[PDB]
Amino acid sequence: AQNPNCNIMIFHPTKEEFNDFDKYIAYMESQGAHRAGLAKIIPPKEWKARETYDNISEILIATPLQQVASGRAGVFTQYHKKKKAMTVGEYRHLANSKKYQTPPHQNFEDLERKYWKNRIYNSPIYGADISGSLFDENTKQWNLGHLGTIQDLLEKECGVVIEGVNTPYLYFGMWKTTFAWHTEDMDLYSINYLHLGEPKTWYVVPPEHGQRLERLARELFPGSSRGCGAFLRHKVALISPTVLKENGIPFNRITQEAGEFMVTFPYGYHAGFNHGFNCAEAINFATPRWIDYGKMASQCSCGEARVTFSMDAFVRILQPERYDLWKRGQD
Ligand SMILES: O=C(O)CNC(=O)C(=O)O
Numbered sequence: 017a018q019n020p021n022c023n024i025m026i027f028h029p030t031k032e033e034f035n036d037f038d039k040y041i042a043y044m045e046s047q048g049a050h051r052a053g054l055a056k057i058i059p060p061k062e063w064k065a066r067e068t069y070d071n072i073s074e075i076l077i078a079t080p081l082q083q084v085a086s087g088r089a090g091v092f093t094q095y096h097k098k099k100k101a102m103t104v105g106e107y108r109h110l111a112n113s114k115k116y117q118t119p120p121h122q123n124f125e126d127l128e129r130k131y132w133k134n135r136i137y138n139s140p141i142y143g144a145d146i147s148g149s150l151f152d153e154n155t156k157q158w159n160l161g162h163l164g165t166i167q168d169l170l171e172k173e174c175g176v177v178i179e180g181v182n183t184p185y186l187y188f189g190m191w192k193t194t195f196a197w198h199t200e201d202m203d204l205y206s207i208n209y210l211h212l213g214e215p216k217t218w219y220v221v222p223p224e225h226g227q228r229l230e231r232l233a234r235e236l237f238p239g240s241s242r243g244c245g246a247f248l249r250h251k252v253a254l255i256s257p258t259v260l261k262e263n264g265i266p267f268n269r270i271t272q273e274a275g276e277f278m279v280t281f282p283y284g285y286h287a288g289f290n291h292g293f294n295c296a297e298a299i300n301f302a303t304p305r306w307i308d309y310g311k312m313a314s315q316c317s318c319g320e321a322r323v324t325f326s327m328d329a330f331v332r333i334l335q336p337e338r339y340d341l342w343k344r345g346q347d
């Protein structure tokens with residue numbers, strides 16, 4: 017079995033290997049990359065996402081989210097307080113202000129220590145979940161707006177045509193902005209490109225061990241767990257690496273830098289934080305190997321998780337027994 021310790025793998029495809037996206041995902045899996053839940057892909061030196069980032073300041077962040085924490089430094093939840101609209105240029109200035117800017121630090125490890133010590137005492141503002149793309153239309157390789165759609169993959173595998181669309185999303189971050197522990201909707205893959213700015217640190221649990229994270233989370237957030245049998249779908253819970261290690265949960269960590277892709281694999285729980293002002297683009301995708309994970313994915317039906325239009329058909333076709341309860345949760 018390849019990669020039996022479930023380490024995060026890093027790939028350096030050649031320009032020729034960068035042509036065929038599906039083929040390269042399958043190659044990475046042939047080497048055991050999916051066992052980690054997360055892989056890094058460094059593009060060939062000949063590639064670029066677009067020519068410059070000099071003209072992005074007028075993008076609007078219609079609903080910036082202030083991420084307010086509750087709990088203790090290593091075990092907390094966050095809620096999202098909606099703020100007034102602002103442009104990317106306004107948000108960049110805010111990120112760089114004395115109130116929000118990255119503190120002085122020695123290296124990524126020092127900054128990680130500072131994150132986990134101090135995150136709960138601040139409320140950073142995240143420009144997350146903005147429909148759109150920063151890839152040039154002429155970028156033909158690994159262009160996240162030109163991937164094969166999940167609806168087409170379902171149709172190709174299973175024969176059933178379904179409604180829905182699959183488009184990317186932009187994330188404008190600042191120091192301490194946080195993504196809570198989660199798997200993707202319907203335990204899909206994700207791919208994330210860090211277009212510009214400061215790094216993003218990731219934590220990940222191997223898919224084969226995801227239920228160990230779920231059992232810990234039920235113990236650590238006992239009210240939330242009574243509320244909902246899949247409350248990690250709410251995307252609000254944080255658990256630090258120190259707490260994971262104290263509880264014997266297998267995990268790994270890695271820092272993504274500008275110009276790098278990350279891929280999350282089906283049922284790979286992940287969480288992390290931004291180092292300073294940055295912009296990422298991400299989208300969900302599927303392969304043939306995903307279908308069995310989609311059929312088995314948990315679902316939130318308590319009302320909280322509320323999701324996109326296109327999840328309806330995935331539940332309806334892959335999980336017909338759960339459909340009626342899940343849809344009640346949507347309504
Ligand atoms: O970058 C973020 O805030 C969160 N991203 C992801 O969870 C992802 O790409 O799958």
Ligand SMILES: [Mg+2]
Nearest residue numbers: 072073074075
């Ligand atoms: Mg602009």
Ligand code: NI
Nearest residue numbers: 199200206286
């Ligand atoms: Ni994700």
Ligand SMILES: [Zn+2]
Nearest residue numbers: 244316318320
């Ligand atoms: Zn729920």
